[PDB]
Amino acid sequence: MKIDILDKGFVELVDVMGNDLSAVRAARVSFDEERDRHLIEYLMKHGHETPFEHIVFTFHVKAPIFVARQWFRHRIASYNELSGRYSKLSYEFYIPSPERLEGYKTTIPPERVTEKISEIVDKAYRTYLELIESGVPREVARIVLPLNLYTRFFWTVNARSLMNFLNLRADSHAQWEIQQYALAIARIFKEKCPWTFEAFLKYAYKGDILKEV
Amino acid sequence: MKIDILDKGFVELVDVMGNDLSAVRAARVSFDDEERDRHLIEYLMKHGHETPFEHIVFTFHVKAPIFVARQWFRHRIASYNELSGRYSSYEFYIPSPERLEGYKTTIPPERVTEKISEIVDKAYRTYLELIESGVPREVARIVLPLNLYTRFFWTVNARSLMNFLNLRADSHAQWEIQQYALAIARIFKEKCPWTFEAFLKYAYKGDILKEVQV
Amino acid sequence: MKIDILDKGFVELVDVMGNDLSAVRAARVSFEERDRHLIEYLMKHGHETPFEHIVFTFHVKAPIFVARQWFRHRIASYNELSGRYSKLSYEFYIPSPERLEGYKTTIPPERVTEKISEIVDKAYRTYLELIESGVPREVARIVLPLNLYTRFFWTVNARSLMNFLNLRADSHAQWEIQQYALAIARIFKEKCPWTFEAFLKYAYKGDILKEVQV
Amino acid sequence: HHMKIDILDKGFVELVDVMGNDLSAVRAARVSFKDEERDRHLIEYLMKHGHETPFEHIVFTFHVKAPIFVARQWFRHRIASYNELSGRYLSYEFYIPSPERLEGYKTTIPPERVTEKISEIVDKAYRTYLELIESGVPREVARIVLPLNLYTRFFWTVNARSLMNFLNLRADSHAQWEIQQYALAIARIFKEKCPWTFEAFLKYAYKGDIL
Ligand SMILES: Cc1cc2nc3c(=O)[nH]c(=O)nc-3n(C[C@H](O)[C@H](O)[C@H](O)COP(=O)(O)OP(=O)(O)OC[C@H]3OC(n4cnc5c(N)ncnc54)[C@H](O)[C@@H]3O)c2cc1C
Ligand SMILES: Cc1cc2nc3c(=O)[nH]c(=O)nc-3n(C[C@H](O)[C@H](O)[C@H](O)COP(=O)(O)OP(=O)(O)OC[C@H]3OC(n4cnc5c(N)ncnc54)[C@H](O)[C@@H]3O)c2cc1C
Ligand SMILES: Cc1cc2nc3c(=O)[nH]c(=O)nc-3n(C[C@H](O)[C@H](O)[C@H](O)COP(=O)(O)OP(=O)(O)OC[C@H]3O[C@@H](n4cnc5c(N)ncnc54)[C@H](O)[C@@H]3O)c2cc1C
Ligand SMILES: Cc1cc2nc3c(=O)[nH]c(=O)nc-3n(C[C@H](O)[C@H](O)[C@H](O)COP(=O)(O)OP(=O)(O)OC[C@H]3O[C@@H](n4cnc5c(N)ncnc54)[C@H](O)[C@@H]3O)c2cc1C
C-alpha cells in the first residue's frame, strides 16, 4: 500500500501489528461484532487512549526536509532516516505546483514562482556537485542544499500517537505540504483500523480537513 | 507461546511486528542476504546504533504479583494496560520453602510458607466480607497483600525490551522478576534470534543470560 | 510547602525550575499584561509545548495503591523507596468512617474502619514474625497490604502535570488520589498562577478544580 | 544561568535556567527531603552501576542558535523538550565554514575559494527568497529555497540523564565537527553546574573521546 504525495514523495505501509481488536483485547486484558465496536467508541469518547497504543504501524516516507523537520517533532515514535552509510543516496527536490500558490495575489505568475524555485535548486545542486568534485567532504558540501531536498525515513508509531499526529497535522492550520502527508497517513490508518478511525473522527479528532475529505 | 512463572503466573505472547530483518530494513531505510544482514545486526549492536531495533515490537500478556508488577512498570518506554482493581481471579504468590532454602532462619522454611498462606487467607476473607457488606471494591481491596496476582498487556519495542533484560535478567534483581525476565528473553530469542545473539555478545550488561540457555 | 493528605501522607515541594515567564520566553524563544495575554493565548490555542519548560520536583508520601495509580503517568521521573532494601515507617492508610459516607452498607462505617485496622495489624505482626525469623525483607514484605505508605520523588514538567490533573483531579478518579491531585494543584497554582488559571479556563478537562478552591 | 558560549561563526549555546545540582540526584537516590565525602561517593556509585534515574532530577534549559543541519541532528533526541523559531511565521544569518574547516582535505581549489563559493550560493538563495516574499509568496513556501546552513534558534529543556546520553553520541570524534562543537559547549555548562556528576560521568560512563 503506497500513496504518492507532492511531486516525488510518498507514504508506504511497511508493516502493522494488530487491528481494531488489538485495542479491544488490551482494554479487557484478555487473550461479539457489535459489542466490540461499542467498546471502541466507548474508549474513544471517554478519553481512554492507552488501549490504542497496542496497535502499531511502520511507514516508509519520502518527504522534503522542511516537512520531515515538522514531522520529527512528534517524539512519541521511532525514526530512522537516510545517512548514506547503509544505503545509496539520491538528490530530488520538491518543486511546488503553480496551483500551490492559488489564493494569493502574487505579483509574480505562479508559473514563474515554480521556475525561480526550480532555478535556485539547480544552482545549489550544481554548486554542491562542484564542491564534491573539488574534494570537499559531503557533510560540508551538503550544507548548501535547500530545505526542499527530499529525504526518506522509516517511522514506527502506535495508534494513539498516530491520532495525535493527525489531530495536529491533518488540520488547516498545519502547512499544506504536511497536511497532504497526514491525509495519506489517515487513509492507511482507516484501511487497517476502520472502527478506531471512525470512532476517532466521531469523538476525538480535533482537526478539520478529515471531516471534509 | 505461553510460559508458566512462579506458582500461578505466566508470560504469554499476544502479537509481534517484524523480525530481525525489520531492523535491517529500518537501518538501510529500504523496503524491498543472511550473511550480510546478520553482519549488519552485529555492527549496529557493537557500535550502539540502537534505533533500528525500535522497529520490532512485541505485545505480551503477563500475570504477576503486584510487588513484581510495581518493579516492571518502572520501565516507562512501553505501553501498559492492567486489570482495574477498582472495577473488576484473586490468586496470590505463596513462596515455596525452596525460596528460603538458602538463608538461615529460626523456623523451618515450610513454616514461613504456612505463615504467608495463613495471612493471605485472612486478608482475602476480610476483603470478601467487606465486599459483602457493600463496601466499594476500591476501598475493600486496600487490605489485600502485595503478593496478589495482577495481569497486564505490555507492548514494547526490541530496544526497550533489551534495556528491560539488562536490568531484570540479572542476579542483582529480585529472584521473582528474574524468572519473568528469563521468559521474556526466551520469547525474544525465538522471534529475533539474530538480534538476541548480537545482544548477548555486544550489549547485554547482565549476568544470567550468558549462563542459562534460552 | 508541605501539604498533609489523608491520615499520614503528604505532598512536599522539593524544587521548581521557572515560573509562568519560563513558558512565555520559550514560546517567544528569547531570553505584565502582554505576557499573561500570551499564556492564555497558548492555552486556548492548544500550544502546549512552551509549558514543558516549567519543571517541578515533589516528595510524596502515599499508600501503595495510590502510588501505583500515580506511576501510570510515564512522562515524568520517579525514585521510590525500595521494598527490598529501604527502611520503612510501617504506617498504613486507615479510611475514616466518613470515607464510606453515601454507600449503603450492611455494617456501620466505623465497623469497616475497625476491620481494616485489624487486618493491617495482623499482617504487620506476621511480617514482624518473618523478619525476626531471618526471612529477607524482599520476601517478608509481600504480606503487607496495599494501604502501606511509601515515598517517592517525582519530577514533572507543567504540561505533564496538567495532564495528570486532567485525569486525577476528577470525580472519576479514586477519592484518595483526588486528594493528592488537589495538593499538587495547590502547589502548581502558587508557583504558576497565570498558567494555572489559563489551564482551568481553557484546557482543564476535569471537574473538581472548577469547584474546589485552590 | 547567564552562561553563554559562542559556537561557529554566529552560533551560541546559552544557559537559561537550571533546577538542582549534584545534591539533587543524591536526595532523589536516597528518596529523602549526609556529608560531601559520602554524597560524592554515592554519585560515583550510581554512575558506576548504571543507576541513572536519580540524575533525571537535575534539569537544564538552554537557548541555542545553530544551523538547521545541526538542529536536525539535535532534535533526534526525543527525551527532551523543544521550542524553535517558526519559518512559517528572523534575521536570516548563515553558517559559512572557515577555510580551516577543510584542513587535512586536499581540495582541487583553495579552501578560501570553497568558503567563497558557499557564501555565493547562500547569497543567491537568500536573495531569491526575498524576491518571492516581496512578490507576495507565503513565507512557508518561499523559505524552502533556503540552504541547510541557515541559522535557527530554539529552547531546549533536558534532564542530566538525557544530557549524558546526548554527550555520549555527539561529543565524539565520529560525530560531525560542527555538532561536536555544540556538544562541547553543552558539556562545558554541564560541568560548571554539576561538577561531581560530570566528573563521575567522564570516569565511568562517558563513551565518547573528545571530552
Ligand atoms: C556518528 C552518528 C551517525 C548517525 N547515523 C544515523 C543514521 O544513519 N540514521 C538515523 O536515523 N540516525 C542516525 N544518527 C542519529 C541517532 O539515531 C541518534 O543518536 C538518535 O536518533 C537519538 O538518540 P537516542 O535514541 O539515544 O536519544 P533519545 O531519543 O533522546 O532517547 C534517550 C533514551 O531513551 C530511549 N528511547 C527514547 N525513545 C524510545 C523509543 N520509542 N523506543 C526505545 N527506546 C527509546 C533509549 O534508551 C535512548 O538512548 C546518528 C548519530 C551519530 C552521532
Ligand atoms: C538491581 C535494581 C535496583 C533498583 N533500585 C531502585 C531504588 O533504590 N529506587 C527506585 O526508585 N528504583 C530502583 N530500581 C528501579 C529503577 O528505577 C528502574 O530500573 C527504572 O525506573 C526503569 O529503567 P530505565 O530508566 O532504564 O527504563 P525506561 O523507563 O523504560 O527507560 C528506557 C530508556 O529511556 C530513558 N528515559 C526514559 N524516560 C526518561 C526521562 N524522563 N529522562 C531521562 N531518560 C529517560 C533512558 O535512556 C532509559 O534507559 C531498581 C532496579 C534494579 C534492576
Ligand atoms: C500550525 C502549527 C504551528 C506550530 N508552530 C510551532 C512553533 O512556532 N515552534 C515550535 O517549536 N513548534 C511548533 N509546532 C510544533 C508543535 O509544537 C508540535 O505539535 C509538537 O512539537 C509535536 O506534538 P506533541 O507534543 O503533541 O507530540 P509528541 O512529541 O509526539 O508527543 C505526544 C504526547 O506525549 C506528550 N509528551 C511527549 N513528550 C513530552 C514531554 N517531554 N513533556 C510533556 N509532555 C510530553 C504530550 O501529551 C503529547 O501530546 C507547530 C505545529 C503546528 C501543527
Ligand atoms: C477514572 C480512571 C480509570 C482508569 N482505569 C484503568 C484501567 O482499567 N486499566 C489501566 O491499565 N489503567 C487505567 N487508568 C490509568 C490510565 O491508563 C492512566 O491515565 C494512564 O496510564 C496514564 O495517562 P497518560 O497516558 O495520559 O499519561 P502519561 O503516561 O504521563 O503520558 C502523557 C502523554 O504522553 C502520551 N504518551 C506517553 N507515552 C506514550 C506511548 N508509549 N504511546 C502513545 N502515547 C504516549 C499521550 O499523549 C499522553 O496523554 C485509569 C485512570 C483513571 C483516571
DSSP per residue, B143-174: GSBTTBEEEEEEEEEHHHHHHHHHHHSSTTS-
Nearest to D144 among A66, A76, A134 (CB): A66
Within 8 A by CB and 6+ apart from C175, the residues are C99
Q: Does B61 touch chain A (CB under 8 A)?
A: yes
Q: Which helix (H) or strand (E) holds A9?
A: strand A9-17
Burial (Cβ within 10 Å: 0-12, 13-18, ≥19) of residue B87: exposed
Q: Which amino acid is at A152?
A: R
After which residues are there C–N gaps above 2.5 Å in chain D?
A: 33, 89
How many whole angstroms separate alpha carbon D128 and alpha carbon B56? 45
Report yes or no: D83 and C26 within 8 Å, Cβ to Cβ.
yes
Strands C9-17 and C55-63: antiparallel
Q: Which residue has 570537499 as its cell numbers?
A: A136
Within 8 A by CB and 6+ apart from A149, the residues are A64, A65, A91, A92, A93, D148
Within 8 A by CB and 6+ apart from B84, the residues are none
Contacts of residue A148 in chain D, CB cutoff 8 Å?
A: 144-145
How many whole angstroms separate alpha carbon B8 and alpha carbon A34? 34
Q: Is the dihedral of CA B104, B106, B112, B116 positive or negative?
A: negative
Nearest alpha-carbon partner for D69 in B158, B197, A128? A128
Report yes or no: B129 and B142 within 8 Å, Cβ to Cβ.
no
Report yes or no: A29 and B83 within 8 Å, Cβ to Cβ.
yes
In the structure grid, which three cell numbers stand for residue D17, read together? 535556567
HSE (side-chain half, CA atoms, 13 Å) at D204: 13
Strands D59-67 and D151-159: antiparallel
User: For position D164, which CATH number holds?
Assistant: 3.30.1360.170
What is the resolution of the experimental data for this entry, in Å? 1.8
Whether D86 has a binding-site annotation, put simply, is yes
Within 8 A by CB and 6+ apart from A113, the residues are A96, A98, A101, A106, D132, D135, D137, D141
Question: Phi first, then psi: what are they for A16, rounded to 5°?
Answer: -150, 140
Experimental method: X-ray
How many whole angstroms separate alpha carbon A210 and alpha carbon B112? 62
In the structure grid, which three cell numbers stand for residue A181, read together? 502527508
Q: How many CB atoms lie within 10 A of CB A211?
A: 10
Please name every residue paired with D14 in a beta bridge, in sequence order, or none if there are none.
D4, D63
Q: By three-state DSSP, how is residue D46 classified?
A: helix
Q: Which residue has 549526609 as its cell numbers?
A: D34
Give the number of the ligand closest to the Cα of residue D182.
1
How many whole angstroms separate alpha carbon D14 and alpha carbon D185? 9
End-to-end alpha carbon distance in chain C? 14
Q: Does A167 touch chain B (CB under 8 A)?
A: no
CB contact under 8 A, B57 and A17: yes
Within 8 A by CB and 6+ apart from B15, the residues are A17, A18, A22, B58, B59
In the structure grid, which three cell numbers stand for residue C212, read together? 474546589
Nearest alpha-carbon partner for D66 in D156, D145, D172? D156
How many whole angstroms separate alpha carbon A106 and alpha carbon D138? 9
Residue range(s) defining the domain that contains residue C142: 1-214
- Residue B168 annotated as catalytic: yes
How many whole angstroms separate alpha carbon D70 and alpha carbon C193? 36
Q: By three-state DSSP, how is residue D39 classified?
A: helix
How many whole angstroms separate alpha carbon D200 and alpha carbon D43? 7
Q: Is the dihedral of CA A182, A184, A186, A192 positive or negative?
A: negative
Question: Phi first, then psi: what are they for B8, rounded to 5°?
Answer: -145, 10
How many whole angstroms separate alpha carbon A28 and alpha carbon A14? 28
Q: By three-state DSSP, how is residue D58 classified?
A: coil
How many whole angstroms separate alpha carbon D102 and alpha carbon D115? 10
Q: Which amino acid is at D15?
A: L
CB proximity under 8 Å: C 143-162 to B: 143-148
How many whole angstroms separate alpha carbon B14 and alpha carbon B58? 8
How many whole angstroms separate alpha carbon D180 and alpha carbon D90? 25
- Cα B1 → chain centroid: 14
- Cα A101 → chain centroid: 21
Q: By three-state DSSP, how is residue B15 classified?
A: strand
Which strands sit side by side in the sheet containing B149-157, from one edge to the other? B2-5, B9-17, B57-65, B149-157, B79-82
Q: Which amino acid is at B187?
A: I
Binding residues of B, by number, are: 51, 71-77, 82-86, 141, 157-159, 163, 168
Please name every residue paired with D13 in a beta bridge, in sequence order, or none if there are none.
D5, D64
Nearest to B79 among A29, A54, A58 (CB): A54
Q: By three-state DSSP, how is residue D33 classified?
A: coil
Within 8 A by CB and 6+ apart from D156, the residues are D61, D62, D63, D64, D74, D80, D81, D82
Q: Within 6 Å (CB) of ligand 1, which residues are found?
A: A 78-81, 83, 85; B 51, 54, 77, 157, 159-160, 163; D 76-79, 162, 165, 169-170, 174-175
Please name every residue paired with A145 in a beta bridge, in sequence order, or none if there are none.
none
How many whole angstroms separate alpha carbon A154 and alpha carbon A11? 10
Q: By three-state DSSP, how is residue A108 classified?
A: coil
Report yes or no: B184 and B214 within 8 Å, Cβ to Cβ.
no
Could you give the angle at which helices C175-191 and C158-168 cross, rounded to 10 degrees? 150
The dihedral over CA atoms of A161, A165, A170, A174, expressed in degrees to the nearest 10, equals: 160
HSE (side-chain half, CA atoms, 13 Å) at B97: 7
How many whole angstroms separate alpha carbon C183 and alpha carbon C185? 5
How many whole angstroms separate alpha carbon C186 and alpha carbon C181? 9
Length of chain C: 214
| Neighbour subunits, B (≥3 Cβ pairs < 8 A) | A, C
Q: Which residue has 498533609 as its cell numbers?
A: C4
Cα radius of gyration (chain A)? 20
- Alpha helices for chain C (secondary structure H): 20-28, 33-45, 64-70, 109-132, 137-140, 158-168, 175-191, 193-198
Length of chain A: 213
How many whole angstroms separate alpha carbon A94 and alpha carbon A6? 7
- Among chain C residues, the shortest Cα distance to B67 is held by C142
CB contact under 8 A, C79 and D57: yes
Report yes or no: C213 and C176 within 8 Å, Cβ to Cβ.
no
Report yes or no: A64 and A9 within 8 Å, Cβ to Cβ.
yes
Strands C149-157 and D4-7: unpaired
Closest approach atom of ligand 4 to CA A49: 25
DSSP state of C97: G
Nearest alpha-carbon partner for B155 in B2, B16, B21? B16
Distance to chain A for B100, nearest Cα, Å: 33
Q: Within 6 Å (CB) of ligand 4, which residues are found?
A: A 50, 53, 76, 158, 160-161, 164; B 79-82, 84; C 72-75, 160, 163, 167, 172-173
Report yes or no: D201 and D26 within 8 Å, Cβ to Cβ.
no
How many whole angstroms separate alpha carbon D57 and alpha carbon D50? 15
Whether D84 has a binding-site annotation, put simply, is yes
Q: By three-state DSSP, how is residue A174 classified?
A: coil
How many whole angstroms separate alpha carbon A159 and alpha carbon A189? 8
Report yes or no: B93 and B149 within 8 Å, Cβ to Cβ.
yes
Nearest alpha-carbon partner for D30 in D44, D48, D42, D45? D42
After which residues are there C–N gaps above 2.5 Å in chain B?
A: 32, 88
How many whole angstroms separate alpha carbon A148 and alpha carbon A145? 8
Strands A2-5 and C77-80: unpaired
Distance to chain A for D82, nearest Cα, Å: 8
Q: Going along B39-92, which residue ranges are E strands? A: 57-65, 79-82
In the structure grid, which three cell numbers stand for residue A100, read together? 500551490
In the structure grid, which three cell numbers stand for residue C174, read together? 479514586
After which residues are there C–N gaps above 2.5 Å in chain A?
A: 31
DSSP state of A3: E
Contacts of residue C53 in chain D, CB cutoff 8 Å?
A: 61, 81, 83, 155, 157
Q: Which helix (H) or strand (E) holds B110?
A: helix B109-132
- Cα A153 → chain centroid: 10
Number of structural domains found in chain A: 1
Q: Which residue has 466507548 as its cell numbers?
A: A42
DSSP state of C178: H
Q: Is the dihedral of CA B25, B27, B30, B34 positive or negative?
A: negative
The dihedral over CA atoms of D107, D112, D114, D117, expressed in degrees to the nearest 10, equals: -150
Distance to chain D for A27, nearest Cα, Å: 27
Q: Does C67 touch chain D (CB under 8 A)?
A: no
CA angle, residues C119, C120, C126, in degrees to nearest 5? 90
Report yes or no: C17 and D59 within 8 Å, Cβ to Cβ.
yes
Whether D73 has a binding-site annotation, put simply, is yes
In the structure grid, which three cell numbers stand for residue B22, read together? 525489520
